[PDB]
Amino acid sequence: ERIVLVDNKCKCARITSRIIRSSEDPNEDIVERNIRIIVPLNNRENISDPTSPLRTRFVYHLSDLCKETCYTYDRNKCYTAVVPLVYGTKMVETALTPDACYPD
Amino acid sequence: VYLLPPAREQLNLRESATITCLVTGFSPADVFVQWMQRGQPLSPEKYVTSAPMPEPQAPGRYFAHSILTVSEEEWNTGETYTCVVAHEALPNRVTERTVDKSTGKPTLYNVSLVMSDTAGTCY
Amino acid sequence: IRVFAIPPSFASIFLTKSTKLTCLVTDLTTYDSVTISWTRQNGEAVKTHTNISESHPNATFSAVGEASICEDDWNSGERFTCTVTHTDLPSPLKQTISRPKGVALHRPDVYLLPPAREQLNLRESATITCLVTGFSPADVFVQWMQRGQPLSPEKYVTSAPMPEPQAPGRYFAHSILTVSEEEWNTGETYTCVVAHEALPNRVTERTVDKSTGKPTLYNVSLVMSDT
Amino acid sequence: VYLLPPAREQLNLRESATITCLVTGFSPADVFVQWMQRGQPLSPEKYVTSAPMPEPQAPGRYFAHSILTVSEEEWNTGETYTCVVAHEALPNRVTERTVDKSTGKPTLYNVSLVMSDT
Numbered sequence: 190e191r192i193v194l195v196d197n198k199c200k201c202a203r204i205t206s207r208i209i210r211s212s213e214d215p216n217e218d219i220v221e222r223n224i225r226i227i228v229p230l231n232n233r234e235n236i237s238d239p240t241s242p243l244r245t246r247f248v249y250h251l252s253d254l255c256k257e258t259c260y261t262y263d264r265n266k267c268y269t270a271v272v273p274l275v276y277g278t279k280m281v282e283t284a285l286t287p288d289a290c291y292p293d
Numbered sequence: 294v295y296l297l298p299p300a301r302e303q304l305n306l307r308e309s310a311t312i313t314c315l316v317t318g319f320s321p322a323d324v325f326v327q328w329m330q331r332g333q334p335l336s337p338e339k340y341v342t343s344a345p346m347p348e349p350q351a352p353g354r355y356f357a358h359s360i361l362t363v364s365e366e367e368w369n370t371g372e373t374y375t376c377v378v379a380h381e382a383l384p385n386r387v388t389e390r391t392v393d394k395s396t397g398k399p400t401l402y403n404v405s406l407v408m409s410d411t412a413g414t415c416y
Numbered sequence: 417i418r419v420f421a422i423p424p425s426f427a428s429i430f431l432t433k434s435t436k437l438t439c440l441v442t443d444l445t446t447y448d449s450v451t452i453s454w455t456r457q458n459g460e461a462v463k464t465h466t467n468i469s470e471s472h473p474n475a476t477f478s479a480v481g482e483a484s485i486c487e488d489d490w491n492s493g494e495r496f497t498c499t500v501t502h503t504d505l506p507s508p509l510k511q512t513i514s515r516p517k518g519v520a521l522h523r524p525d526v527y528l529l530p531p532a533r534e535q536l537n538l539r540e541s542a543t544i545t546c547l548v549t550g551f552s553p554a555d556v557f558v559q560w561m562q563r564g565q566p567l568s569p570e571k572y573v574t575s576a577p578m579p580e581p582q583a584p585g586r587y588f589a590h591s592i593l594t595v596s597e598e599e600w601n602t603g604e605t606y607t608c609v610v611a612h613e614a615l616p617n618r619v620t621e622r623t624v625d626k627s628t629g630k631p632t633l634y635n636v637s638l639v640m641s642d643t
Numbered sequence: 644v645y646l647l648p649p650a651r652e653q654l655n656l657r658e659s660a661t662i663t664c665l666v667t668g669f670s671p672a673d674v675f676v677q678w679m680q681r682g683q684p685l686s687p688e689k690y691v692t693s694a695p696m697p698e699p700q701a702p703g704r705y706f707a708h709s710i711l712t713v714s715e716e717e718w719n720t721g722e723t724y725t726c727v728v729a730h731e732a733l734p735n736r737v738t739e740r741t742v743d744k745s746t747g748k749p750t751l752y753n754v755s756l757v758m759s760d761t
């Protein structure tokens with residue numbers, strides 16, 4: 190019944206809303222803006238370079254994302270960082286998350 | 294373009310649901326406006342349109358207005374009464390905006406941050 | 417006279433596309449006129465083998481039998497045969513190797529455990545345990561990587577596969593790395609990579625530094641503007 | 644012996660918890676291990692240790708490792724699960740260490756929530 194104002198899958202924010210149609214009094218209703226965030230406290234600040242510090246601040250200018258440096262691995266679109274391997278050197282690909290980088 | 298909702302005290306007389314669409318600081322004049330309700334243009338007499346009187350403090354820009362009323366009982370279905378501006382100086386010459394009851398401002402939040410290592414994922 | 421038949425790793429292929437297959441004999445006698453021939457299952461011989469071994473310093477004498485094939489051939493899984501014909505025992509021994517068939521594909525689940533706080537109190541050395549799990553077939557490959565420079569393998573040691581107690585088919589492995597605690601105390605994260613033929617782009621990896629692994633401290637400082 | 648508790652990630656999957664017992668830099672070879680909890684042991688099938696490997700950095704002081712794998716649905720409950728080690732060089736021939744969930748638990752949170760509309 191709620192109305193997802195925003196669902197930002199690379200900040201794990203989700204502003205919904207729902208008018209709490211009150212007890213059947215006159216129009217003394219109050220609309221209601223649920224919010225929800227799942228901050229990781231595990232990832233980098235360069236989400237796609239696991240050679241950086243972790244994170245401390247998590248800033249949500251909701252104005253900005255009520256409409257690109259956002260910090261959760263989105264499930265569906267996957268990432269990578271070309272990484273050297275040595276068997277001689279070779280500068281070669283990776284797949285920084287599995288089960289989504291599957292060329293299928 | 295903005296679309297202000299009615300006043301709370303308006304919504305106690307229990308008949309007149311005023312709605313305000315608007316336009317601000319633009320050049321030039323000759324702009325056309327109208328209100329759209331579910332892909333359906335309203336009654337042209339139902340609203341009333343202003344004319345582009347000039348800005349107070351801007352150098353030469355223009356602005357106009359338009360107002361529309363409905364049953365305040367209707368201000369329970371809402372349907373956001375989209376006001377369709379129509380100005381020449383727009384990328385597609387229309388900068389529609391709209392507003393409903395659910396829009397506007399709530400006075401009951403409930404923020405619900407969670408916190409976990411089981412993250413970095415955004416299911 | 418003991419012969420090791422050495423099939424190239426899937427990793428060696430995939431990082432070279434050069435599926436050399438070799439067989440070594442160890443602690444035989446290095447006469448000259450040492451002869452070993454690579455043949456297919458058909459008996460038909462294949463390309464030759466150059467740069468062959470010589471007499472070892474410690475009498476653990478050796479001879480490398482080099483070869484090559486097309487990768488699909490090995491994927492097809494037919495027996496390959498290098499046979500030793502030297503006068504020591506001019507009886508032709510038979511080294512037959514193939515690729516198993518029927519093994520399913522299963523992925524490494526690379527966790528990465530950080531050094532135990534106790535070891536950080538002996539005050540010199542730190543150890544990190546890259547782990548792979550629940551995967552098929554055997555022969556994962558791993559190395560360790562940090563700050564964009566590779567880590568020459570004499571730092572790290574790796575296990576080999578050996579079946580799970582619980583999983584009927586899936587093997588696992590390890591890797592161990594030893595580093596000065598101040599180096600790990602420096603921050604200075606570490607990334608262990610794995611390459612294995614059930615992995616989508618063939619290569620996944622994970623990382624850890626002091627902060628990620630088992631921190632006593634959680635310092636969120638999150639700001640939420642314009643509700 | 645350093646005992647290591649299962650990765651958060653693995654507990655994330657909450658699938659089966661593996662505890663790794665990691666013997667270190669000792670001599671000579673022929674170490675032995677078996678897993679003990681509440682004082683009665685577990686079948687040597689519930690875990691697997693490959694026999695001693697040489698250590699690279701130090702000279703031929705050896706190391707080894709066995710891994711105990713358990714239902715996390717149990718490692719969520721306590722069950723201190725210690726790993727006993729036997730080695731001739733050991734001043735009492737037998738050492739144990741152990742761990743439970745409350746062994747890597749972070750001490751302190753440091754939340755700083757600054758909800759505003761500015």
Ligand SMILES: *[C@@H]1O[C@H](CO)[C@@H](O[C@@H]2O[C@H](CO)[C@@H](O)[C@H](O)[C@H]2NC(C)=O)[C@H](O)[C@H]1NC(C)=O
Pocket residue numbers: 235236237238269270
């Ligand atoms: C830091 O992040 C930026 C962007 O988030 C990365 O920039 C590019 O990332 C792509 C990813 O495929 C690479 O192909 C490019 O080469 C990167 N450009 C540059 C200039 O690095 C950047 O790679 C990240 N930091 C590091 C060290 O990789």
